[PDB]
Amino acid sequence: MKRTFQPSNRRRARNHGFRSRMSTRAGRSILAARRRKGRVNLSA
């Protein structure tokens, strides 16, 4: 059947990309928190 994950790289980058996170203070704090934890991937 049709499943929940239908991949689109354009939509993924628009939704979770670095610039989307930088666009708002919540996303900037998410990037700061992922830096604090030490993730090698800060965003999509």
Site of interaction with RNA (CB under 7 A): 1-11, 14-15, 23, 25
The nearest distance, CB 7 to RNA, in angstroms, is: 4
CB of 18 to RNA, least distance (A): 15
Angle, CA of 42, 3 and 40, to the nearest 5°? 15
Give 11 or 39: the residue with its C-beta nearer to RNA. Answer: 11
Least distance (Å) between residue 10 CB and RNA:
5
Rounded Cα–Cα distance for residues 41 and 9 (Å): 16
Instruction: From 32, 11, 10, select the one nearest 21 (Cα to Cα).
Output: 32
